[PDB]
Amino acid sequence: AEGDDPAKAAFDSLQASATEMIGYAWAMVVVIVGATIGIKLFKKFTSKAS
Amino acid sequence: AEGDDPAKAAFDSLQASATEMIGYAWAMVVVIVGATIGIKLFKKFTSKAS
Amino acid sequence: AEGDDPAKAAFDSLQASATEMIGYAWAMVVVIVGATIGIKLFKKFTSKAS
Amino acid sequence: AEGDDPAKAAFDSLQASATEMIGYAWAMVVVIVGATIGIKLFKKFTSKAS
Amino acid sequence: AEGDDPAKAAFDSLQASATEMIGYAWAMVVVIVGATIGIKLFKKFTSKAS
Amino acid sequence: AEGDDPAKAAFDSLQASATEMIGYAWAMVVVIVGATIGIKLFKKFTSKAS
Amino acid sequence: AEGDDPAKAAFDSLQASATEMIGYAWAMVVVIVGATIGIKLFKKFTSKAS
Amino acid sequence: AEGDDPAKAAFDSLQASATEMIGYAWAMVVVIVGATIGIKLFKKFTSKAS
Amino acid sequence: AEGDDPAKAAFDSLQASATEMIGYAWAMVVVIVGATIGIKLFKKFTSKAS
Amino acid sequence: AEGDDPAKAAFDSLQASATEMIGYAWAMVVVIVGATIGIKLFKKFTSKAS
Amino acid sequence: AEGDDPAKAAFDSLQASATEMIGYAWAMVVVIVGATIGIKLFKKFTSKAS
Amino acid sequence: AEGDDPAKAAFDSLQASATEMIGYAWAMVVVIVGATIGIKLFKKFTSKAS
Amino acid sequence: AEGDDPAKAAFDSLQASATEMIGYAWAMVVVIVGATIGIKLFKKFTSKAS
Amino acid sequence: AEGDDPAKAAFDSLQASATEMIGYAWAMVVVIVGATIGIKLFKKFTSKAS
Amino acid sequence: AEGDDPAKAAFDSLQASATEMIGYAWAMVVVIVGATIGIKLFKKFTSKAS
């Protein structure tokens, strides 16, 4: 109930850092998936021709 | 039985602090899991296309 | 039984996100399949002429 | 044998919370699988046409 | 050899409490595993369709 | 050798659930295969005419 | 060398319990595999017709 | 909120590497597909003559 | 150098007990692993059929 | 170098079990392939008549 | 309130050392992760080709 | 530098045991792979006939 | 702030070792992937002929 | 930076083993493909006669 | 500053023993990893054939 007020910022400071790197884990996947899916179509273009 | 009354607030003051940081451990996981699961689907979208 | 009420929204918030991206996995397939099938007919038009 | 009676509710309170979130893990899968399977058929419709 | 007779109940009282909570650790796992396994099958139903 | 008797029902309860959903994985395939094969004949009717 | 004789039954009692549940892990797989393989054939019946 | 600034470059350095190799996975497919499709036509030239 | 002779049996008595229970930790693993590996093959039989 | 002699039989006992089920994975395929190939000829008999 | 002033530098001297080695634990992970992720892509390049 | 000489055999005794069981992990794989590959060919014999 | 200067080399000595073995984990993958991909083409050469 | 020199041979010893078995994975495919392709021609000789 | 000179050898004698057993922890891993990796390739040889 006391002595934690200036310790609240302690975690909000860790959490706020989380949201920073969390954004990379989110776009990271999409950065990969961009090709992951696109590459799927490249192959679709391949098997459809038959 | 005596001399502890003003010591009861001592712990309720530690416990009440617990509930404060406990809320971070709870949302922390969800803060991470938010992507943890969402990222799962991103991959589902990936393997389903086959 | 307690301390989870504000954690229920935690998951409904992840699930509700699921339904959002889930809609893409559903239309994604159809987006592809649109040609997948249409392209089938294009070929039917091809082998039938004989 | 004593001092645990009011501690029994302690766990039934954790377990009862389990059943709450457990329901999400159960429907979660089905929420995903809904498309997981449906998407299977979409593809069946695709390979059968040949 | 003496002065412990009324101390025997001391431990049987702790042990007897153990058997009480021990039952929760046993059913707890099964409470979780219930879905743990069931959810396995849900996925089996998923990969088998191919 | 002891403390497992009431835990035997634990698994028979998971297994018995298995047999329940297992029946769906079995009929599921046949539900699909019904057309899978029938659709084969539809095509046989197609190539035989030549 | 002493004080363990009545502790030998302690483990044989845990091991003997193992053999009990171990039988479920063994039949469990086969319970699943029953369809796992059978379902394979169902599909064989499917691709062979071509 | 602090101590991560010089850690941001840490990931942008991994991501930037991703874009480097990602370009190979993209052209790789096309490098293969170049023949994958071209070879399709070679065969078209083959079955059309009938 | 003296007063330990009858204390040597003290430890050989603890060690000798070790070798007794140690045999269970050794066969325990194998008791489990028996299925651990056997169950592996059961699954091999499963994925090979494709 | 010691304490493993009676543990050697431990694995030879798992391996020897392997050879037992391994024989099923071998004949299993042939059990299926028996028709897999035979069914091929049935179809050969079909396309040759033209 | 007194006799600690020259002891404040005592800890700032330990903490300041922390920040020194802390920088290694941070870059250490990234030093490893550099390949950890890069190696992931190497494998992506591997499974995508199918 | 002293008191370890008779402790060197301690580990060479564990290591020497390693080489014993290590030989099983090596042949184990090959014992399985024997069919793993052979079974591959069985299937090759299957798809080639078309 | 003091007593760590000669401890800085301690870690740079571990890190510098990391970069040494890290190079193997990097080329290791490529050493494998060399065939991983090359073997892919070998098979492409196989399915394209149809 | 130290204590790894005699550990460098550790990996070159694993890698050098890789190149040994890697040669089998390379010729293995060709060993199979030898017939894989040759068998293709056998069939070409078959459909060309029409 | 005095009375420790003949105590310096005390630790160099413990440290020197460390370097002795430390060599086993280093080669131990490699002794295991030898198969750990080699066994990886054995499996690569397995999945590549498809």
Side-chain angles (χ1 to χ4, degrees), chain M residues 12-14 16-17 20-21 23-25 27-28 31-32 34-35 38-39 42-43 45-46 49-50, chain N residues 1-2 4-5 7-8 11-12 14-15 18-19 22 25-26 29-30 32-33 36-37 40 44:
Chain M
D12 279 292
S13 287
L14 276 64
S17 287
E20 278 199 1
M21 301 151 304
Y24 300 6
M28 277 280 318
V31 177
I32 308 163
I39 284 60
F42 279 55
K43 288 211 169 312
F45 295 45
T46 281
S50 298
Chain N
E2 59 202 306
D4 182 71
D5 291 283
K8 187 196 305 250
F11 276 138
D12 279 292
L14 276 64
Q15 283 191 176
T19 303
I22 278 302
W26 275 79
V29 167
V30 160
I32 308 163
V33 165
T36 305
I37 279 179
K40 309 206 51 42
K44 309 203 100 45

mmCIF file of all heavy atoms in Angstrom, chain M residues 12-14 16-17 20-21 23-25 27-28 31-32 34-35 38-39 42-43 45-46 49-50, chain N residues 1-2 4-5 7-8 11-12 14-15 18-19 22 25-26 29-30 32-33 36-37 40 44:
data_model
loop_
_atom_site.group_PDB
_atom_site.id
_atom_site.type_symbol
_atom_site.label_atom_id
_atom_site.label_comp_id
_atom_site.label_asym_id
_atom_site.label_seq_id
_atom_site.Cartn_x
_atom_site.Cartn_y
_atom_site.Cartn_z
ATOM 1 N N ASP M 12 34.041 -10.893 -22.783
ATOM 2 C CA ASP M 12 34.467 -10.760 -24.176
ATOM 3 C C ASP M 12 35.163 -12.047 -24.613
ATOM 4 O O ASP M 12 35.171 -12.387 -25.794
ATOM 5 C CB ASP M 12 35.378 -9.535 -24.376
ATOM 6 C CG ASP M 12 34.620 -8.210 -24.504
ATOM 7 O OD1 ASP M 12 33.912 -8.015 -25.518
ATOM 8 O OD2 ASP M 12 34.747 -7.360 -23.596
ATOM 9 N N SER M 13 35.720 -12.774 -23.640
ATOM 10 C CA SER M 13 36.393 -14.046 -23.910
ATOM 11 C C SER M 13 35.366 -15.164 -24.150
ATOM 12 O O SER M 13 35.621 -16.093 -24.930
ATOM 13 C CB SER M 13 37.387 -14.408 -22.797
ATOM 14 O OG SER M 13 38.540 -13.582 -22.877
ATOM 15 N N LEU M 14 34.193 -15.057 -23.520
ATOM 16 C CA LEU M 14 33.126 -16.028 -23.736
ATOM 17 C C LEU M 14 32.406 -15.678 -25.020
ATOM 18 O O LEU M 14 32.158 -16.544 -25.849
ATOM 19 C CB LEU M 14 32.118 -16.187 -22.570
ATOM 20 C CG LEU M 14 32.526 -17.139 -21.419
ATOM 21 C CD1 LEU M 14 33.751 -16.653 -20.674
ATOM 22 C CD2 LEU M 14 31.370 -17.334 -20.458
ATOM 23 N N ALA M 16 33.572 -13.906 -27.604
ATOM 24 C CA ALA M 16 34.484 -14.169 -28.717
ATOM 25 C C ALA M 16 34.517 -15.651 -29.066
ATOM 26 O O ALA M 16 34.803 -16.026 -30.197
ATOM 27 C CB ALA M 16 35.884 -13.680 -28.380
ATOM 28 N N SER M 17 34.209 -16.493 -28.096
ATOM 29 C CA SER M 17 34.181 -17.927 -28.323
ATOM 30 C C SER M 17 32.872 -18.254 -29.022
ATOM 31 O O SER M 17 32.790 -19.142 -29.868
ATOM 32 C CB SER M 17 34.270 -18.729 -26.990
ATOM 33 O OG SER M 17 35.568 -18.700 -26.387
ATOM 34 N N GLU M 20 32.942 -17.852 -32.587
ATOM 35 C CA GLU M 20 33.710 -18.942 -33.193
ATOM 36 C C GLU M 20 32.816 -20.125 -33.544
ATOM 37 O O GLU M 20 32.849 -20.629 -34.658
ATOM 38 C CB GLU M 20 34.823 -19.475 -32.269
ATOM 39 C CG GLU M 20 36.118 -18.673 -32.272
ATOM 40 C CD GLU M 20 37.293 -19.476 -31.725
ATOM 41 O OE1 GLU M 20 37.087 -20.659 -31.368
ATOM 42 O OE2 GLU M 20 38.420 -18.926 -31.663
ATOM 43 N N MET M 21 32.033 -20.575 -32.582
ATOM 44 C CA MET M 21 31.148 -21.711 -32.786
ATOM 45 C C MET M 21 29.889 -21.293 -33.512
ATOM 46 O O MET M 21 29.256 -22.092 -34.181
ATOM 47 C CB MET M 21 30.805 -22.360 -31.464
ATOM 48 C CG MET M 21 32.019 -22.837 -30.713
ATOM 49 S SD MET M 21 31.748 -22.823 -28.948
ATOM 50 C CE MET M 21 31.291 -21.114 -28.675
ATOM 51 N N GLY M 23 29.794 -19.529 -36.034
ATOM 52 C CA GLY M 23 30.090 -19.689 -37.445
ATOM 53 C C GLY M 23 29.812 -21.095 -37.945
ATOM 54 O O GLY M 23 29.564 -21.302 -39.127
ATOM 55 N N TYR M 24 29.853 -22.065 -37.050
ATOM 56 C CA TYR M 24 29.600 -23.449 -37.419
ATOM 57 C C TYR M 24 28.104 -23.705 -37.528
ATOM 58 O O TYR M 24 27.653 -24.442 -38.385
ATOM 59 C CB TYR M 24 30.205 -24.423 -36.399
ATOM 60 C CG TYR M 24 31.711 -24.316 -36.222
ATOM 61 C CD1 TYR M 24 32.446 -23.320 -36.856
ATOM 62 C CD2 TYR M 24 32.401 -25.209 -35.406
ATOM 63 C CE1 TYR M 24 33.817 -23.216 -36.684
ATOM 64 C CE2 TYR M 24 33.774 -25.109 -35.231
ATOM 65 C CZ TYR M 24 34.473 -24.110 -35.874
ATOM 66 O OH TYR M 24 35.832 -24.010 -35.713
ATOM 67 N N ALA M 25 27.330 -23.082 -36.662
ATOM 68 C CA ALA M 25 25.888 -23.251 -36.691
ATOM 69 C C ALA M 25 25.327 -22.635 -37.952
ATOM 70 O O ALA M 25 24.340 -23.104 -38.487
ATOM 71 C CB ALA M 25 25.241 -22.656 -35.460
ATOM 72 N N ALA M 27 27.195 -22.164 -41.000
ATOM 73 C CA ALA M 27 27.620 -22.979 -42.140
ATOM 74 C C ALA M 27 27.066 -24.391 -42.053
ATOM 75 O O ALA M 27 26.899 -25.055 -43.066
ATOM 76 C CB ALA M 27 29.128 -23.022 -42.251
ATOM 77 N N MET M 28 26.767 -24.838 -40.842
ATOM 78 C CA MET M 28 26.203 -26.166 -40.644
ATOM 79 C C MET M 28 24.918 -26.283 -41.416
ATOM 80 O O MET M 28 24.737 -27.185 -42.223
ATOM 81 C CB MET M 28 25.874 -26.435 -39.174
ATOM 82 C CG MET M 28 27.035 -26.898 -38.320
ATOM 83 S SD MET M 28 27.362 -28.650 -38.546
ATOM 84 C CE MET M 28 25.699 -29.311 -38.567
ATOM 85 N N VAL M 31 25.528 -26.284 -44.928
ATOM 86 C CA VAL M 31 26.196 -27.534 -45.302
ATOM 87 C C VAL M 31 25.160 -28.613 -45.576
ATOM 88 O O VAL M 31 25.300 -29.435 -46.478
ATOM 89 C CB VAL M 31 27.180 -28.024 -44.224
ATOM 90 C CG1 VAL M 31 27.788 -29.363 -44.631
ATOM 91 C CG2 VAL M 31 28.266 -26.984 -43.991
ATOM 92 N N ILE M 32 24.106 -28.574 -44.790
ATOM 93 C CA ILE M 32 23.009 -29.503 -44.928
ATOM 94 C C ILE M 32 22.101 -29.044 -46.056
ATOM 95 O O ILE M 32 21.811 -29.787 -46.986
ATOM 96 C CB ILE M 32 22.188 -29.619 -43.633
ATOM 97 C CG1 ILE M 32 23.108 -29.913 -42.437
ATOM 98 C CG2 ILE M 32 21.149 -30.715 -43.790
ATOM 99 C CD1 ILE M 32 22.478 -29.635 -41.084
ATOM 100 N N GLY M 34 22.653 -27.349 -48.465
ATOM 101 C CA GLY M 34 23.231 -27.483 -49.782
ATOM 102 C C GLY M 34 22.564 -28.619 -50.521
ATOM 103 O O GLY M 34 22.126 -28.470 -51.659
ATOM 104 N N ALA M 35 22.451 -29.750 -49.847
ATOM 105 C CA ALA M 35 21.790 -30.910 -50.408
ATOM 106 C C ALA M 35 20.283 -30.770 -50.267
ATOM 107 O O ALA M 35 19.531 -31.204 -51.123
ATOM 108 C CB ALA M 35 22.247 -32.179 -49.730
ATOM 109 N N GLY M 38 19.425 -28.741 -53.286
ATOM 110 C CA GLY M 38 19.853 -29.465 -54.462
ATOM 111 C C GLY M 38 19.017 -30.704 -54.685
ATOM 112 O O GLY M 38 18.631 -31.009 -55.807
ATOM 113 N N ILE M 39 18.722 -31.403 -53.603
ATOM 114 C CA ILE M 39 17.906 -32.612 -53.652
ATOM 115 C C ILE M 39 16.475 -32.281 -54.069
ATOM 116 O O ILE M 39 15.753 -33.122 -54.589
ATOM 117 C CB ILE M 39 17.927 -33.454 -52.369
ATOM 118 C CG1 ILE M 39 19.244 -34.225 -52.270
ATOM 119 C CG2 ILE M 39 16.751 -34.419 -52.363
ATOM 120 C CD1 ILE M 39 20.465 -33.345 -52.241
ATOM 121 N N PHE M 42 16.579 -32.220 -57.829
ATOM 122 C CA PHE M 42 16.671 -33.592 -58.325
ATOM 123 C C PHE M 42 15.279 -34.170 -58.495
ATOM 124 O O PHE M 42 15.015 -34.920 -59.429
ATOM 125 C CB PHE M 42 17.461 -34.499 -57.372
ATOM 126 C CG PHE M 42 18.951 -34.398 -57.491
ATOM 127 C CD1 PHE M 42 19.592 -33.175 -57.376
ATOM 128 C CD2 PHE M 42 19.714 -35.537 -57.680
ATOM 129 C CE1 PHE M 42 20.966 -33.089 -57.452
ATOM 130 C CE2 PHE M 42 21.086 -35.458 -57.762
ATOM 131 C CZ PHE M 42 21.715 -34.233 -57.648
ATOM 132 N N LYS M 43 14.396 -33.828 -57.573
ATOM 133 C CA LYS M 43 13.033 -34.312 -57.616
ATOM 134 C C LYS M 43 12.200 -33.510 -58.581
ATOM 135 O O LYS M 43 11.280 -34.024 -59.198
ATOM 136 C CB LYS M 43 12.398 -34.482 -56.248
ATOM 137 C CG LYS M 43 13.009 -35.681 -55.549
ATOM 138 C CD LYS M 43 12.042 -36.368 -54.625
ATOM 139 C CE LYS M 43 12.611 -37.701 -54.174
ATOM 140 N NZ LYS M 43 13.128 -38.495 -55.313
ATOM 141 N N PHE M 45 13.268 -32.401 -61.354
ATOM 142 C CA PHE M 45 13.667 -33.052 -62.602
ATOM 143 C C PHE M 45 12.851 -34.318 -62.817
ATOM 144 O O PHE M 45 12.684 -34.792 -63.942
ATOM 145 C CB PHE M 45 15.156 -33.422 -62.576
ATOM 146 C CG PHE M 45 16.112 -32.256 -62.524
ATOM 147 C CD1 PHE M 45 15.893 -31.191 -61.671
ATOM 148 C CD2 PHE M 45 17.276 -32.274 -63.262
ATOM 149 C CE1 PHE M 45 16.806 -30.163 -61.564
ATOM 150 C CE2 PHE M 45 18.189 -31.244 -63.166
ATOM 151 C CZ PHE M 45 17.951 -30.189 -62.316
ATOM 152 N N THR M 46 12.384 -34.863 -61.700
ATOM 153 C CA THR M 46 11.605 -36.099 -61.663
ATOM 154 C C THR M 46 10.116 -35.899 -62.017
ATOM 155 O O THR M 46 9.577 -36.611 -62.857
ATOM 156 C CB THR M 46 11.770 -36.818 -60.312
ATOM 157 O OG1 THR M 46 13.001 -37.528 -60.273
ATOM 158 C CG2 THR M 46 10.656 -37.794 -59.993
ATOM 159 N N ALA M 49 9.104 -34.284 -65.879
ATOM 160 C CA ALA M 49 9.123 -35.143 -67.057
ATOM 161 C C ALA M 49 7.728 -35.625 -67.509
ATOM 162 O O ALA M 49 7.564 -36.000 -68.668
ATOM 163 C CB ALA M 49 10.082 -36.299 -66.842
ATOM 164 N N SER M 50 6.747 -35.647 -66.605
ATOM 165 C CA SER M 50 5.388 -36.114 -66.942
ATOM 166 C C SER M 50 4.647 -35.141 -67.879
ATOM 167 O O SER M 50 4.886 -33.925 -67.784
ATOM 168 C CB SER M 50 4.558 -36.380 -65.679
ATOM 169 O OG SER M 50 5.150 -37.397 -64.893
ATOM 170 N N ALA N 1 37.470 -17.395 -25.896
ATOM 171 C CA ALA N 1 38.810 -17.031 -26.425
ATOM 172 C C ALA N 1 39.865 -18.034 -25.975
ATOM 173 O O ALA N 1 40.955 -18.089 -26.533
ATOM 174 C CB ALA N 1 39.201 -15.617 -26.024
ATOM 175 N N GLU N 2 39.528 -18.841 -24.973
ATOM 176 C CA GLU N 2 40.436 -19.861 -24.461
ATOM 177 C C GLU N 2 39.613 -21.058 -24.000
ATOM 178 O O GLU N 2 38.473 -20.896 -23.573
ATOM 179 C CB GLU N 2 41.290 -19.297 -23.292
ATOM 180 C CG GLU N 2 40.487 -18.776 -22.090
ATOM 181 C CD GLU N 2 41.271 -17.785 -21.226
ATOM 182 O OE1 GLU N 2 42.393 -18.125 -20.792
ATOM 183 O OE2 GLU N 2 40.755 -16.670 -20.980
ATOM 184 N N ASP N 4 38.613 -23.343 -25.974
ATOM 185 C CA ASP N 4 37.797 -23.743 -27.131
ATOM 186 C C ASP N 4 38.656 -24.321 -28.267
ATOM 187 O O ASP N 4 38.153 -25.050 -29.124
ATOM 188 C CB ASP N 4 36.988 -22.528 -27.667
ATOM 189 C CG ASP N 4 36.069 -22.851 -28.847
ATOM 190 O OD1 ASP N 4 35.054 -23.539 -28.637
ATOM 191 O OD2 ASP N 4 36.362 -22.406 -29.977
ATOM 192 N N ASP N 5 39.948 -23.995 -28.281
ATOM 193 C CA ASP N 5 40.848 -24.490 -29.325
ATOM 194 C C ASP N 5 40.671 -26.004 -29.531
ATOM 195 O O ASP N 5 40.435 -26.457 -30.653
ATOM 196 C CB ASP N 5 42.317 -24.120 -28.984
ATOM 197 C CG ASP N 5 42.604 -22.618 -29.069
ATOM 198 O OD1 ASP N 5 42.759 -22.094 -30.184
ATOM 199 O OD2 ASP N 5 42.667 -21.968 -28.019
ATOM 200 N N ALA N 7 38.246 -27.660 -28.774
ATOM 201 C CA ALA N 7 36.807 -27.863 -28.920
ATOM 202 C C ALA N 7 36.394 -27.552 -30.360
ATOM 203 O O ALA N 7 35.289 -27.884 -30.794
ATOM 204 C CB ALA N 7 36.000 -27.035 -27.922
ATOM 205 N N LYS N 8 37.327 -26.942 -31.103
ATOM 206 C CA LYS N 8 37.127 -26.610 -32.515
ATOM 207 C C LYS N 8 37.135 -27.910 -33.313
ATOM 208 O O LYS N 8 36.320 -28.123 -34.209
ATOM 209 C CB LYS N 8 38.279 -25.688 -32.974
ATOM 210 C CG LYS N 8 38.148 -25.115 -34.381
ATOM 211 C CD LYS N 8 39.484 -24.567 -34.888
ATOM 212 C CE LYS N 8 40.088 -23.539 -33.940
ATOM 213 N NZ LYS N 8 40.051 -22.165 -34.509
ATOM 214 N N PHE N 11 33.749 -29.907 -33.273
ATOM 215 C CA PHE N 11 32.765 -29.709 -34.328
ATOM 216 C C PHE N 11 33.295 -30.113 -35.703
ATOM 217 O O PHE N 11 32.602 -30.816 -36.436
ATOM 218 C CB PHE N 11 32.151 -28.308 -34.347
ATOM 219 C CG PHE N 11 30.996 -28.141 -33.396
ATOM 220 C CD1 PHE N 11 30.858 -27.004 -32.624
ATOM 221 C CD2 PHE N 11 30.006 -29.112 -33.335
ATOM 222 C CE1 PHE N 11 29.759 -26.844 -31.802
ATOM 223 C CE2 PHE N 11 28.903 -28.951 -32.527
ATOM 224 C CZ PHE N 11 28.778 -27.819 -31.761
ATOM 225 N N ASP N 12 34.514 -29.726 -36.067
ATOM 226 C CA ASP N 12 35.037 -30.149 -37.366
ATOM 227 C C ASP N 12 34.926 -31.667 -37.481
ATOM 228 O O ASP N 12 34.825 -32.208 -38.581
ATOM 229 C CB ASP N 12 36.488 -29.677 -37.573
ATOM 230 C CG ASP N 12 36.608 -28.217 -38.024
ATOM 231 O OD1 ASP N 12 36.202 -27.903 -39.166
ATOM 232 O OD2 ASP N 12 37.125 -27.391 -37.239
ATOM 233 N N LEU N 14 32.368 -33.373 -36.158
ATOM 234 C CA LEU N 14 30.959 -33.645 -36.419
ATOM 235 C C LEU N 14 30.648 -33.256 -37.848
ATOM 236 O O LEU N 14 30.018 -34.013 -38.575
ATOM 237 C CB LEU N 14 29.956 -32.983 -35.442
ATOM 238 C CG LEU N 14 29.683 -33.728 -34.112
ATOM 239 C CD1 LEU N 14 30.915 -33.821 -33.238
ATOM 240 C CD2 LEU N 14 28.551 -33.061 -33.355
ATOM 241 N N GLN N 15 31.126 -32.084 -38.260
ATOM 242 C CA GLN N 15 30.922 -31.609 -39.632
ATOM 243 C C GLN N 15 31.530 -32.595 -40.640
ATOM 244 O O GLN N 15 30.871 -32.992 -41.599
ATOM 245 C CB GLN N 15 31.492 -30.195 -39.849
ATOM 246 C CG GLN N 15 30.619 -29.080 -39.277
ATOM 247 C CD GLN N 15 31.053 -27.693 -39.718
ATOM 248 O OE1 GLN N 15 30.417 -26.703 -39.399
ATOM 249 N NE2 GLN N 15 32.137 -27.611 -40.458
ATOM 250 N N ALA N 18 29.431 -35.247 -41.240
ATOM 251 C CA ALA N 18 28.301 -34.815 -42.020
ATOM 252 C C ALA N 18 28.603 -35.015 -43.495
ATOM 253 O O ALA N 18 27.848 -35.662 -44.207
ATOM 254 C CB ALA N 18 27.940 -33.368 -41.704
ATOM 255 N N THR N 19 29.719 -34.472 -43.948
ATOM 256 C CA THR N 19 30.116 -34.604 -45.339
ATOM 257 C C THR N 19 30.157 -36.077 -45.761
ATOM 258 O O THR N 19 29.970 -36.395 -46.932
ATOM 259 C CB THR N 19 31.475 -33.934 -45.573
ATOM 260 O OG1 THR N 19 31.440 -32.571 -45.181
ATOM 261 C CG2 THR N 19 31.928 -33.980 -47.014
ATOM 262 N N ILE N 22 26.436 -37.120 -45.892
ATOM 263 C CA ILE N 22 25.801 -36.223 -46.838
ATOM 264 C C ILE N 22 25.972 -36.786 -48.239
ATOM 265 O O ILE N 22 25.087 -36.676 -49.073
ATOM 266 C CB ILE N 22 26.357 -34.772 -46.808
ATOM 267 C CG1 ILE N 22 25.709 -33.946 -45.680
ATOM 268 C CG2 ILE N 22 26.172 -34.096 -48.158
ATOM 269 C CD1 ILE N 22 24.200 -33.859 -45.767
ATOM 270 N N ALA N 25 23.129 -39.148 -49.023
ATOM 271 C CA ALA N 25 21.844 -38.524 -49.285
ATOM 272 C C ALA N 25 21.811 -37.997 -50.700
ATOM 273 O O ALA N 25 20.770 -37.971 -51.330
ATOM 274 C CB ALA N 25 21.555 -37.423 -48.287
ATOM 275 N N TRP N 26 22.971 -37.598 -51.193
ATOM 276 C CA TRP N 26 23.111 -37.086 -52.550
ATOM 277 C C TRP N 26 23.010 -38.236 -53.567
ATOM 278 O O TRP N 26 22.195 -38.192 -54.487
ATOM 279 C CB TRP N 26 24.367 -36.233 -52.846
ATOM 280 C CG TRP N 26 24.274 -34.757 -52.499
ATOM 281 C CD1 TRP N 26 24.401 -34.169 -51.279
ATOM 282 C CD2 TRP N 26 24.109 -33.666 -53.443
ATOM 283 N NE1 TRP N 26 24.294 -32.798 -51.393
ATOM 284 C CE2 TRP N 26 24.114 -32.469 -52.707
ATOM 285 C CE3 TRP N 26 23.940 -33.591 -54.841
ATOM 286 C CZ2 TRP N 26 23.961 -31.215 -53.310
ATOM 287 C CZ3 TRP N 26 23.786 -32.345 -55.437
ATOM 288 C CH2 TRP N 26 23.798 -31.174 -54.672
ATOM 289 N N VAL N 29 19.441 -40.231 -53.679
ATOM 290 C CA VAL N 29 18.448 -39.714 -54.570
ATOM 291 C C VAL N 29 18.753 -40.167 -55.981
ATOM 292 O O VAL N 29 17.907 -40.746 -56.634
ATOM 293 C CB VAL N 29 18.330 -38.181 -54.497
ATOM 294 C CG1 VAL N 29 17.524 -37.643 -55.655
ATOM 295 C CG2 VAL N 29 17.677 -37.771 -53.196
ATOM 296 N N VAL N 30 19.960 -39.922 -56.451
ATOM 297 C CA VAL N 30 20.325 -40.334 -57.801
ATOM 298 C C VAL N 30 20.183 -41.842 -57.989
ATOM 299 O O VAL N 30 19.848 -42.300 -59.078
ATOM 300 C CB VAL N 30 21.732 -39.876 -58.203
ATOM 301 C CG1 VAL N 30 22.256 -40.716 -59.354
ATOM 302 C CG2 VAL N 30 21.707 -38.405 -58.591
ATOM 303 N N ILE N 32 17.964 -43.695 -56.721
ATOM 304 C CA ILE N 32 16.548 -43.900 -56.918
ATOM 305 C C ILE N 32 16.131 -43.288 -58.243
ATOM 306 O O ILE N 32 15.541 -43.943 -59.094
ATOM 307 C CB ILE N 32 15.714 -43.275 -55.787
ATOM 308 C CG1 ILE N 32 16.228 -43.744 -54.416
ATOM 309 C CG2 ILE N 32 14.254 -43.652 -55.968
ATOM 310 C CD1 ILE N 32 15.768 -42.886 -53.251
ATOM 311 N N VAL N 33 16.456 -42.011 -58.401
ATOM 312 C CA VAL N 33 16.138 -41.255 -59.603
ATOM 313 C C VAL N 33 16.633 -41.956 -60.852
ATOM 314 O O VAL N 33 16.044 -41.816 -61.919
ATOM 315 C CB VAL N 33 16.725 -39.817 -59.578
ATOM 316 C CG1 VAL N 33 16.698 -39.193 -60.965
ATOM 317 C CG2 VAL N 33 15.964 -38.937 -58.604
ATOM 318 N N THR N 36 13.856 -43.686 -61.513
ATOM 319 C CA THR N 36 12.758 -42.727 -61.545
ATOM 320 C C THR N 36 12.610 -42.136 -62.938
ATOM 321 O O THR N 36 11.517 -42.087 -63.475
ATOM 322 C CB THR N 36 12.914 -41.636 -60.479
ATOM 323 O OG1 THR N 36 13.054 -42.202 -59.191
ATOM 324 C CG2 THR N 36 11.734 -40.703 -60.411
ATOM 325 N N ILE N 37 13.718 -41.708 -63.519
ATOM 326 C CA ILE N 37 13.712 -41.149 -64.857
ATOM 327 C C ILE N 37 13.685 -42.244 -65.911
ATOM 328 O O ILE N 37 12.850 -42.233 -66.807
ATOM 329 C CB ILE N 37 14.916 -40.211 -65.106
ATOM 330 C CG1 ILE N 37 14.644 -38.827 -64.513
ATOM 331 C CG2 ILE N 37 15.225 -40.107 -66.594
ATOM 332 C CD1 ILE N 37 15.785 -37.850 -64.697
ATOM 333 N N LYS N 40 10.564 -43.414 -66.618
ATOM 334 C CA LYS N 40 9.724 -42.447 -67.281
ATOM 335 C C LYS N 40 9.757 -42.740 -68.760
ATOM 336 O O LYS N 40 8.724 -42.875 -69.407
ATOM 337 C CB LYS N 40 10.274 -41.052 -67.059
ATOM 338 C CG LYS N 40 10.536 -40.743 -65.602
ATOM 339 C CD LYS N 40 10.456 -39.265 -65.338
ATOM 340 C CE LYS N 40 9.155 -38.717 -65.891
ATOM 341 N NZ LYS N 40 8.003 -39.621 -65.612
ATOM 342 N N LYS N 44 7.302 -43.594 -71.850
ATOM 343 C CA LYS N 44 7.208 -42.757 -73.016
ATOM 344 C C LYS N 44 7.121 -43.682 -74.215
ATOM 345 O O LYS N 44 6.253 -43.538 -75.067
ATOM 346 C CB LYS N 44 8.462 -41.882 -73.174
ATOM 347 C CG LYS N 44 8.824 -41.110 -71.933
ATOM 348 C CD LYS N 44 9.647 -39.890 -72.246
ATOM 349 C CE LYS N 44 8.767 -38.661 -72.254
ATOM 350 N NZ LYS N 44 7.845 -38.646 -71.085
#
